[PDB]
Symmetry: none
Subunit: 145 residues, 2 copies
């Protein structure tokens, strides 16, 4: 996935200033930029009007454990929030699932992040995808530089 | 719910499954737990509406908080990464770790089932089965939740 340097700067500046998880206090800007340039962190998704309700077009499903964070860069998504599944539209720079990253910790149970919402693609999507593991590694890397 | 069958399953759990061993749970309490309402359940099978959500006792990558012991009937089990399919019948049990798994250390998030402020928290300690269980016929089975199991332990602790 090839993106322009301008777009990379915009998403970098937004996360570093708006999302505390990526604040310079938690994560150095040098590491953050490397994390964004990491392969498959930035992804795209081709939309199919025929298969609109396909599983490949659901970034999040309510009551389905997930372990990654998303930042929409381009495109439209439908969001189903709450018990009644209140639908509304979200576009660029709407993010989801930060708690999957920043949540603090064989025969044990597992702490998971379960979204109280669903996110479905309405059109072609370009977005960021950062897993808890990628984020925790980014903290350790920035925790020593 | 014949007395003969109830004793058989009691002896099986108390001897085969350590979670219900006399060391963990007295045999007197175990019997009371089995006679507890809704611990023993049934399920009518519909050949027309097979693969229905009401016929899945367990679903892959779907958090669960209960234990099952088949008493009568057949189920299809899809186990592991490669989804090895096999058939299981009476006295096949599932989800023991759902009961005996210990919580995360120095963790404040609530466990699924206990409902300790779960209604508003998105972080939940869960047991996630690496398998699926689908009903192939009418089922009679035991169903013990983590909370019902923990309550049985406290009862036997006195």
């Amino acid at each position: 996935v090839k993106i322009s340097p301008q777009l990379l700067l915009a998403m970098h500046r937004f996360l570093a200033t708006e999302v505390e998880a990526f604040s310079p206090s938690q994560m150095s800007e040098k590491i953050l930029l490397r994390l964004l340039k990491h392969p498959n962190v930035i992804q795209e998704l081709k939309y199919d009007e025929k298969n609109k309700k396909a599983p490949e077009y659901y970034l999040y499903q309510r009551n389905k454990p997930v372990d990654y964070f998303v930042l929409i860069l381009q495109g439209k998504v439908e969001v189903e929030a709450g018990k009644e599944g209140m639908k509304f539209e979200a576009s660029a720079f709407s993010y989801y699932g930060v708690m999957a990253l920043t949540a603090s910790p064989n025969s044990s149970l597992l702490q998971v992040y379960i979204p109280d919402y669903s996110v479905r693609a309405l059109s072609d999507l370009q977005f960021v995808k950062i897993s808890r593991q990628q984020y925790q590694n980014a903290l350790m890397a920035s925790r020593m530089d």
